[PDB]
């Protein structure tokens, strides 16, 4: 079957969890730090704000 998704989907769809600097791997975060001046990856990841 597969009937639902329920409540901790809110901290998995990133509307209540952590910044996109805490849930991303620290390799992709470092790459993003260093590449922001010719390619931007910041507008493709959620930041919850509660």
């Amino acid at each position: 079957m597969a009937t639902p998704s329920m409540l901790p989907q809110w901290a998995y769809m990133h509307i209540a969890g952590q910044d996109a600097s805490e849930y991303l791997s620290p390799g992709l975060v470092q790459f993003a730090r260093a590449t922001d001046t010719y390619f931007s990856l910041g507008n493709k990841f959620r930041n919850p704000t509660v």
Binding site: G27, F31, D36, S40, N43, N47, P48
Partner: peptide
């Protein structure tokens, strides 16, 4: 509401892969 935004920049040149 109208507003709602949560996509914005939070920003050998590599560590390990």
């Amino acid at each position: 509401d109208i507003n709602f935004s949560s996509l914005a920049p939070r920003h050998s040149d590599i560590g390990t892969s």
